[PDB]
Amino acid sequence: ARSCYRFRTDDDGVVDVAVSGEDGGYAVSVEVPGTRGREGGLVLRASGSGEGVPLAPAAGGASLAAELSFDPTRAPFYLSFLLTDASGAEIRTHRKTSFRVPVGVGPGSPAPLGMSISGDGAVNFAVYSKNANAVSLYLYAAAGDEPALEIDLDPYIHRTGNVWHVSLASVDGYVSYAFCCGGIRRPLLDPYAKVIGDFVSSMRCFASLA
Amino acid sequence: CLRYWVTEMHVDGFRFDLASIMTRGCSLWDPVNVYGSPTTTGTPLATPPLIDMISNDPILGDVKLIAEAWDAGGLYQVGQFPHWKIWSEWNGKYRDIVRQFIKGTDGFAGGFAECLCGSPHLYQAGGRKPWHSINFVCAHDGFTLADLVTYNKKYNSSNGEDNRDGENHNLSWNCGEEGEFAGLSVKRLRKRQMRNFFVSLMVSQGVPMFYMGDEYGHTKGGNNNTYCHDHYVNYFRWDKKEESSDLQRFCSLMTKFRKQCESLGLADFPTAQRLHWHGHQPGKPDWSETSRFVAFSTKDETKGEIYVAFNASHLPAVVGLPERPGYRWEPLVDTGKPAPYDFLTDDLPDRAHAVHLFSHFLNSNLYPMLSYSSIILELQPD
Amino acid sequence: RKRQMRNFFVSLMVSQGVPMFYMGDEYGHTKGGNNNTYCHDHYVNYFRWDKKEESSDLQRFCSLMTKFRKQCESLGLADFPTAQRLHWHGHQPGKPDWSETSRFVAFSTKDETKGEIYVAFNASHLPAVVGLPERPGYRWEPLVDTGKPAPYDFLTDDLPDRAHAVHLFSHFLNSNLYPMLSYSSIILELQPD
Ligand SMILES: OC[C@H]1O[C@H](O[C@H]2[C@H](O)[C@@H](O)[C@@H](O[C@H]3[C@H](O)[C@@H](O)[C@@H](O)O[C@@H]3CO)O[C@@H]2CO)[C@H](O)[C@@H](O)[C@@H]1O
Ligand SMILES: OC[C@H]1O[C@H](O[C@H]2[C@H](O)[C@@H](O)[C@@H](O[C@H]3[C@H](O)[C@@H](O)[C@@H](O)O[C@@H]3CO)O[C@@H]2CO)[C@H](O)[C@@H](O)[C@@H]1O
Ligand SMILES: OC[C@H]1O[C@H](O)[C@H](O)[C@@H](O)[C@@H]1O
Ligand SMILES: OC[C@H]1O[C@H](O)[C@H](O)[C@@H](O)[C@@H]1O
Ligand SMILES: OC[C@H]1O[C@H](O)[C@H](O)[C@@H](O)[C@@H]1O
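C-alpha cells for the assembled complex are given below, as produced in the milestone run.
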C-alpha cells in the first residue's frame, strides 16, 4: 500500500516521494538519488518553515533521503516542499514549482471515464475537461448540503492530457459525489454517471456512489 | 491503439508515417452506399474524421502529434495538414530550402530567412506557432548529414532494385570531389558544411530534429535508402564516434547554446523588435536572387544580444557588425576555425588569448569569414 | 595612427634604396604639430629617452623591421628588381590593380636566403581577405601584420606562443587567404609544408 511520485528536478536530477498509508497516519519518504548537483547535502524545506528535516545518507550515500509522518484521521491534503543544498540555493521541479504530493488520495487512472471500482476496492474518478485548469471532487454523505469532503486535484499528478483523475482508498460514509471545475463552487453532475440523484432547482444533482 | 500506447506504455508523442493517407476519405460516403444511388474513395478531406478524433481526444489531444504530410499517391500537404491548431509537421520545405541555401544556390536567402523564423508563411496564418514546425536537414530516409556533403547522387545498387530507390532530387553537394577520398581542402569544407547545417538547425525557430549518427558524421556510403540492410551501414558506430569527437563536441555545445539562449526556442514568431536582419553591413540585408549571405541579430534576455551570420557564398568576407555603443562583440562560434576553437568555452585554458588574437578585428566591429561558413557572436559590455 | 606609423616603417624597410628616418621616429616623437622646429632648444627638439621606453612596442617593431631587411637578400638589391623575381598581386594573386581607384599594392619576391616573401599594403578604408599566391608544397607563414596588437605585430621566435598565434589563423592560411584591416600591411614568408 504505497504510491510513488518521481519528480524531475530543474538541476538534472530526480526526487522520489513514496506515500504509504498506515495501518492510520501517512509516511512520506523522500529520496534523492544521484550526485553532483546536490554536492554537499540538502535539506527538505517543507513549505519553507523553520523545520526542514535534513536528508541523511540512506543508501550507501548515493541515495540521500528523509522520512516524514502525518497524523491519522486527516482529510486528503497536499505536502508541498522544496530542497535546499548546503549553500542556500533552492531546488525546484523542472516546471519551476515546489515538489507537491497528494496524501490520502492516489494518482488514479484516465479510463474508464466516470466512476469505477477497482479490484482492491479503491474508487477511481475520471472526468474530461479541456477548458478547466482546476478541478476538485466533492463527496457528500447522507443528510448533505455542503460537501462532506473536498479533494482538489493537482494539475500535474491528477491529470493525463485533458482527463482529470483521482483514486480513493474507499468511499465509506459517502453516498454521492460531484465535480467543481474552473474554480466556481457549484457542484456538477458527472456526464458518465450511471446512477444519479434527484434534481434540485440554481440547478443541482449528484452522481450516486452506489 | 494510440490511447493504449499513451496510458499503458507511457509514450509522450507520435510521428505518423505518410499521415496524408489519414486525410483520404473512405468509400462509405460514396453516394451509392449512402442514399442508395448517385465524394469517392481516396479523396483528400478538409476535416478528416480520424484526425478530428485524434486532435480532440481527451488523452491524445495533449500529446505530441507530428505528421509526415505526404504520401506515395501524389498528395503533399506541408503547411496544410488538417491541424486544429494542434498538429505539428515534418517541415520538408525547411529541409529543401536549407539544403539549397547552405550548398550555395541562388535565390534562397529570403526562403532561408523565413526558415530561420519558424516558417511564418506556412504556420502563422493557420493559427500555429513556430514550434509546430519540425525542422530537420536529414532523416532515416535520404542522405545522412555526412553523405549530404560527400555525394551528389544516390548509390542504391546494394538495395537490389537497379538503383531505382530513394529521392532523386537530394539537393546535395560533394563539396568538390566526390567520394570519401578527396583532398584536404574538400575535407575541411565538408567539416565546415556539417557544422553549418547543425548551426542553422540549432538557431532556427521550431523544433530541431536530427537522425542518429549525424552528431559524429555517420556515412552510409552514398546509399540514401537503406531500408533493407541489417549490417553496420545502419548501425551507430561507437568506435567511429571517438574518431570524430570534435563534431560531436560541436553539436553538443550548439545544443547547449540553444538551450541557454532565451531567444531561440521562442513560443511565438520573431518580431522586428527583437530580430533585425543585416548583410555584409548592418541593417542592409541582400534579398536578391544573387544573395548568398544571411545575417541577423536577436535581443536575448540572458545573452544580451546574439549576432548570427551565414556566408554560403564561395568568397570570404569581412562582415561589419552592428554598432552598439559601450559594447563589444565577443566571438562564440566559427565553423571555419580548427577544433576546439570552432566553439569557444571556458574549458579551453587559452580562450582569452584566442579572443585577443582577433580583438583587432572585433574592436573595429568586423569579423573575417571564410566561404561557406557561419559565425555566432555575443554582445558583452565593454 | 599606430597602424599608419607601422605602415610607413614597413614601406620604408621593404623598398629598394637606402631607408632613412629622423631620430625619434622609431618611438613616435611628436613636436606638437610644429612643422619647422628650427629655432628651439626646448624638449620639443630633444630625443625623449623616457618616452621611447613607454612606446617600446613601436621601437621594437622598428628594430625587428630593420633586422628583417638586413636578413632578406631580396631587399638589399644591388640592382633594380627583375620581373623574374618580383611579381605583382592584387586582392587576388597575379591580378594587380593599377587603376586610378586602386589603393592596394602587393608583391611577392624570391629570396635566395629565405624562400619567398609576400608583402601587401591595403591603403583603402575597407578590409580585404586577400588571396595569396598558390605555391604547391609550401604554405605562407605570418610574419608582420601592422593591425595586430603588440607584440604580435611582428612575430618572432622570442614569443612563447608564436605557434598558437599562427594556428589561430591557420584556417585562413590553409586556403591561401589573409584578412587585412583598412589602412594596414602584412608580410608573410613561404615555408615548406
Ligand atoms: O554556383 C555557381 C557559383 O559558385 C560556384 O561554386 C560552387 C557552388 O557555389 C556550389 O553550389 C556547387 O555547385 C553544385 C550545386 O550546389 C549542386 O547542385 C551540385 O550537385 O552541383 C554543383 C557543382 O557540380 O559547386 C560550385 C563549384 O563547383 C563557383 O565557384 C562560382 O564561380 C559560381 O559563381
Ligand atoms: O524582422 C522580423 C521579420 O522577419 C522575417 O521577415 C523577413 C523575411 O524572413 C525575409 O524573407 C525577408 O523578406 C523580404 C524578401 O526576402 C524580399 O524578397 C523582399 O521582397 O522583401 C521582403 C521583406 O521586405 O526579410 C524580412 C524582413 O525584412 C519574418 O518572415 C517576419 O515574419 C518577421 O516579421
Ligand atoms: O511531391 C513533391 C514532394 O514530395 C515529397 O514528399 C518530397 O519529400 C519533396 O521533396 C517533394 O517536393
Ligand atoms: O521524402 C520522403 C520520400 O519518401 C516517401 O515515402 C514519399 O512517398 C515520397 O514522396 C518522398 O519523396
Ligand atoms: O520505388 C520505391 C520507392 O517508394 C517510395 O515512394 C520511397 O520514397 C522511395 O524511397 C522508394 O524507393
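The beta strands of chain C are 86-89, 104-111, 115-122, 128-131, 138-145, 177-180, 184-192. DSSP finds five helices and seven strands in chain C. Further analysis is deferred to the final report.
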